[PDB]
Design a protein around this ligand. Structure first.
Ligand SMILES: CCCCCCCCCCCCCCCCCCCC(=O)O[C@H](COC(=O)CCCCCCCCCCCCCC)COP(=O)(O)OCCN
Length: 510
């Protein structure tokens, strides 16, 4: 007994917040338990009740530390495997990353308690979702952002699936936070009205999820094929292995050359500069056009700037019928949002010589234009997003065009190894496909290579960590979703209104 005495202790709540914070990771990874997200948000909402601003900030920081150290720890695997640093240094780096990610949850909890101290429906339903949206935007914007582990992505297959195509995964985050706050308030106050309101709010989008915003045109059906080279990441960036990788990809492509129409290779499938492999690319494009196919592969390009400086762009070249290959062609995609510490190392003067982990091969990339024309191959338009860029919903939507028939994503998940990072990335890609209502053609070296339907459901998939070829027929779709039409503008208007109302009520509370 005496639960009230123990629960009203800051030290105990810190330990209890760690468990509830880590409980949220059961919704993104292959665990895929969407009630866990609601439970974790309920814990975060409840454990900050009746606390001073500093204690609430500590509770939020511990919750974020659990969440981002129990499901972002797969970064440590990549760091240790492909970087020469001691184990204490690696664990310090992953702990520091978790703490940095948890700062924006501690800030959320602190501001929420500072402005709305008393546990009320207002705080748990209006102020909390708006402030949570603001802090998530800050986390995804500052220092190029790391918008990972957003609970809306857990609703890719759930009751709130249909909310994504209308307003987005960020609005799904908003609704999840609101419902979970109402549930936490009902649990804390032992009341039934917040529970009923939360049930109504959560069950409202279930009929909404049946709306079909896309027309599955079958007249433009193709036979896309994707190749998993299963190239070892350690040997990926070498000299002798380049010929072996090219031979493997060519031999995998040759049977498909003639039967398939949209052969795709993973990110950085060709591990050499585009200019160096010019005759090979020319011959490959010629023989692909002879048999009537296309090859949207990935390569590394080093263009010359106006200042005679070589800028390295992570690129997606296009070859075959419907898109003749040329070094000056505009039918290419340059990666815009580079991955921190892996593609653009900040402070190269000190960080790069500090350890071999910072001085990874093929680094110091150059960002491409934010908005780029869609890739054309065999008469169809593909929206490209290299690896990490897929999770950026706003950038993907901005690059999206009404003429887009497929969403293209190529990644190299061999860094993460056997962990949950590739699965979380795949889930975020599925959420993007659901939001834009376009079929997704995701190709990976070792990670999850699959074709995602317009509703986010997996149409085809191949086992992870193998050298397989995913050959299937995918039908394009036409039509603009409300999310594609608008963006985050409706969500930002809604959260601005809610925040303004909450601030006015807090000031008027006096
Ligand atoms: C006030 C300062 C506070 C600082 C707070 C941060 C401190 C901690 C920072 C260190 C810990 C994070 C380290 C993450 C990078 C580890 C190395 C990963 C390598 C990598 O980036 O993958 C590349 C691209 O990723 C891909 O193409 C696919 C993977 C994309 C997902 C990557 C997820 C991990 C990155 C998370 C970084 C978050 C930083 C947020 C600040 C490989 O791609 P490639 O095959 O073409 O090889 C070409 C490579 N040269």
């Amino acid at each position: 007994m005496a639960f009230a005495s123990l629960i009203e202790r800051q030290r105990i709540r810190l330990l209890l917040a760690l468990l509830f914070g880590a409980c949220g990771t059961l919704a993104f990874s292959p665990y895929d338990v969407w009630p866990a997200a609601i439970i974790s948000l309920m814990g975060l909402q409840a454990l900050t009740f009746n606390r001073r601003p500093l204690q609430s900030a500590a509770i939020g920081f511990c919750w974020g530390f659990g969440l981002f150290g129990s499901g972002i720890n797969w970064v440590y695997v990549s760091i240790a495997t492909f970087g020469g640093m001691p184990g204490p240094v690696n664990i310090f780096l992953v702990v520091l990353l978790a703490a940095y990610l948890s700062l924006y949850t501690g800030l959320f909890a602190g501001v929420l308690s500072r402005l709305w101290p008393k546990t009320t429906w207002l705080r748990v339903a209006i102020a909390a979702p708006a402030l949570w949206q603001v802090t998530e935007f800050l986390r995804g914007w500052v220092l190029t952002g790391f918008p990972w582990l957003q609970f809306g992505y857990s609703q890719i297959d759930g009751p709130l699936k249909g909310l994504a195509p209308i307003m987005g995964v960020e609005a799904i985050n908003f609704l999840l936070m609101m419902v979970s706050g109402l549930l936490a308030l009902a649990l804390v106050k032992r009341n039934w009205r917040p529970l009923v309101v939360a049930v109504v709010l959560f069950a409202l989008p279930f009929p909404l999820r049946y709306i079909q915003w896309f027309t599955p045109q079958p007249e433009k059906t193709i036979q896309v094929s994707m190749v998993q080279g299963d190239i070892p990441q350690s040997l990926k960036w070498d000299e002798g292995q380049l010929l072996n990788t090219l031979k493997i990809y060519y031999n995998a492509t040759a049977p498909l050359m003639g039967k398939s129409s949209l052969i795709i290779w993973p990110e950085s499938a060709i591990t050499d500069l585009e200019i160096n492999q010019q005759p090979f690319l020319k011959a490959l494009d010629g023989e692909l056009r002879d048999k009537g196919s296309s090859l949207v592969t990935g390569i590394v390009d080093a263009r010359l700037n106006k200042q005679n400086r070589y800028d390295t762009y992570n690129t997606i070249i296009t070859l075959g019928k419907g898109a003749p290959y040329s070094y000056e062609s505009a039918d290419r995609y340059n990666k815009n949002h580079l991955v921190p510490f892996g593609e653009f190392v900040p402070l190269e003067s000190i960080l790069r010589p500090l350890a071999p982990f910072f001085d990874l091969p093929m680094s110091s990339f150059s960002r491409g234009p934010y908005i780029q024309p869609p890739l054309s191959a065999n008469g169809i338009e593909l929206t490209a997003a290299i690896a990490y860029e897929i999770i950026l919903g706003e950038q993907v939507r901005d690059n999206f065009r009404p003429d887009t028939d497929y969403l293209l994503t190529i990644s190299n998940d061999a860094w993460f190894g056997k962990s949950i990072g590739p699965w979380q990335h795949f889930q975020m890609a599925r959420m993007r496909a659901l939001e834009l209502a376009r079929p997704l053609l995701r190709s990976t070296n070792n990670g999850i290579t699959a074709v995602i339907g317009p509703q986010g459901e997996i149409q085809a998939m191949i086992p992870q960590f193998t050298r397989e070829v995913l050959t299937t027929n995918v039908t394009p779709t036409t039509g603009l979703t409300p999310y594609a039409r608008t963006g985050n503008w409706p969500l930002w208007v809604l959260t601005a209104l809610f925040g303004f109302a909450a601030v006015l009520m807090s000031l008027r509370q006096r």
